[PDB]
Structure 1
C-alpha cells in the first residue's frame, strides 16, 4: 500500500489478508503499512473516547448541574467501543494464527534464512517481534532438548538439523494441499484489462492453469467456486486474483 482511499478499504484488506492466512498451508509475507495505519487509528480513537469520557465525568461531578441527555449520548460511545473491540479481536486472531504458523515451521525458516541464494529474507516475511520470538524460542527449545536427551546421544548424530540418512527432520509446508477458492477476477472496476484472462463460448472470461504432474489444463471462470491444489495457484493468490474460502 502507498495511500489510503478510505479506512474501510484498509479494513477490507485486513479481513481478506486474515482469511487468506487462516487457510493457506504456507507462511505469507507481512503487510507492515496496513497495521502501521491501523494501530495509530486505534490510538487516536482510544484517546478521543477517553477525553470525552473525562469531560462528561468532570461536568457531572463538579456540581449537580444537568445530567447528560440520554439521547445521542450513550449510543455513539457504545458503537465506537464495540467497533474497537471487534477490530482488536480480528487483529488478535490474525496475530495468533501467524504465531502458531511460525512456531510450526521454525527450523525450516531458520534453515532458509541463512541461505544466501534465497531472494526471500526473514525481514520481509516477519515483524521484528516475531523475529525475536523465533530466535528465543529456537534457542530455548534447543537448550532443553540438548540438556534432556542429546547430551547422552552420540556425537555423529547429535545435530538436530540433519537432512541425511533415512528420515529428514525438516518440515516443509505442503504446497499440494487442496483449498477452496472463489475466482474474484481483477480487482479493478474494468476487470478486463488483465493480460492473462481469455474467453470461452458465451463470453465468460476465464483463467487457464496447468498441472505439471497430471498434464491437464483447467479453466477457471469468474464467479465459480472450485476445489484446486495450492501449488498451482500461488501467483493468482498473491495478485489478489482469487480468494480462498
Structure 2
C-alpha cells in the first residue's frame, strides 16, 4: 500500500466489478475511508492556495498570479477531484439501487442465526440506515394501501410457503464477460490453482456440475461464462469482469 495510484486502481476495479455483477459485493471499508480522507485534505489544500492568492491581491493592488506555471496545476487539481467524486458517486448510487432490489433477501440473511454472511460486513453503516428506513416506509405504504383488507392467514409481505415465493434472490447463473488476468501480482509457480497445458500458457480449470463438464480458461482470453463457477476467482482477483 502507501501508493495513491493503487487506491485509484482498486476503486476502479471495484466499480467495474460492481456494475456487472448480479450479487451485492462486500464493501471495501478501508479503501473508501482512505479516499474520503484524501479528498477532504485535498479540497482544503486547493481552498488554501485560492485564499492565499486572493488575500494578497486586494491588499496593495498587486498583480494577479503570474500566468506561467500558475493556472494549469490548479486547474488539474480541480478536474482530478471532479473525476474522482464522479466515480465514487456512481459506485455508491449503483450499490444503493442493488440494495433496494434485495431488501427482503438481506433481511432474511440478517435474521438467520447459522449464516456466515452478516450485514455488518456486507453493508455500510449509512447503507444500514438506508435499508432500515426504506423498509419501514415501504411497509407502511403497503399496509395502509392494500394489506389491511386481507385475511390474517395471508398478511405477510414475505411468504416462502405460498404459491409463488415472495422473496427474490440474486441470479447465481447469470452470464457475464470476464478477462483472465492470472495471478494478482505474480509468482506463477506459487499459485497452486495454475496448471500448465499443451504448448500454451498455464490455464485455470473450473467445473460445471449441471452440465457436468470441465472448462479451461487460458490466460489472456475473454470468456462469456456463468457467474457461480467463477465466484472464487473473482474474489481472489484472478479474473476481472469486463
TM class by shorter-chain length? over 0.9
CA contact (8 A) 1:179 1:228 kept: yes
Aligned to 2:94: 97
**Per-residue deviation, 1:192:** 3.3
CA-to-partner distance for each residue in 1:71-120, whole Å, 9 max, x for gaps? 11110000000000000000000000000000000011001111010011
Q: CA deviation at 1:188?
A: 1.5
Q: Is the 2:102–2:169 Cα contact (8 Å) retained in structure 1?
A: yes
Query: CA contact under 8 A between 1:186 and 1:192: conserved in structure 2?
Result: no
- The whole-number CA distance in structure 2 between the counterparts of 1:189 and 1:118 is 34
- Paired with 1:192 and 1:32, the residues of 2 have a C-alpha distance of 31
- What secondary structure does 1:195 align onto? coil
Displacement of 1:65 in angstroms is 2.0
How far the C-alpha of 1:193 sits from its partner, in A, is: 1.4
Alpha-carbon distance, 1:198 to partner: 0.4
Contact 2:16 2:241 in 1 (8 A): yes
Give, in angstroms, the shift of residue 202 of structure 1.
1.2
Deviates more, 1:50-59 or 1:65-74: 65-74
2-side partners of 1:78 and 1:91: how far apart?
20
Report the counterpart of residue 119 of structure 1 in structure 2: 116
- CA contact under 8 A between 2:188 and 2:194: conserved in structure 1? no
The question of whether the paired residues in 1 share the 8 Å contact of 2:180 and 2:238 is answered with yes
Measure, in 1, the Cα distance between the counterparts of 2:198 and 2:217: 14
Question: TM-score by structure 2 length?
Answer: 0.98
Distance in 2 separating the partners of 1:58 and 1:165: 71
Instruction: Give the TM-score normalised by the residue count of structure 1.
Output: 0.97
Q: Is the 8 A contact 2:181 2:219 kept in 1?
A: yes
Structure 1 moving runs of 4+ over 6 Å: none
Give the distance between the partners of 2:145 and 2:35, measured in 1 at CA: 44
Does the 8 Å contact 2:110/2:118 carry over to 1? yes
5+ residue gaps, structure 2, are none
Measured in 1, the distance between the counterparts of 2:89 and 2:59 equals 39
1:61 CA drift (Å): 1.0
Question: Residue 81 of structure 1 corresponds to which residue in structure 2?
Answer: 78
RMSD: 0.8
Question: Is contact 2:234–2:240 with CA below 8 Å preserved after alignment?
Answer: yes
Superposed CA deviations along residues 27-75 of structure 1, whole A, max 9, x for unmatched, are 0100010011000000110011001100000111112122221011110
Distance 2:139 2:186 in 1: 52
The answer on 1:225 being equivalent to 2:222 is: yes
User: When the two structures are aligned, how many residues end up with a matched partner?
Assistant: 242
Structure 1 spans left out of the alignment, 5+ residues = none
What is the alpha-carbon distance in structure 1 between the residues aligned to residue 115 and residue 231 of structure 2?
18
- For 2:236, the equivalent position in structure 1 comes to 239
**Separation in 1 of the partners of 2:38 and 2:78?**
13
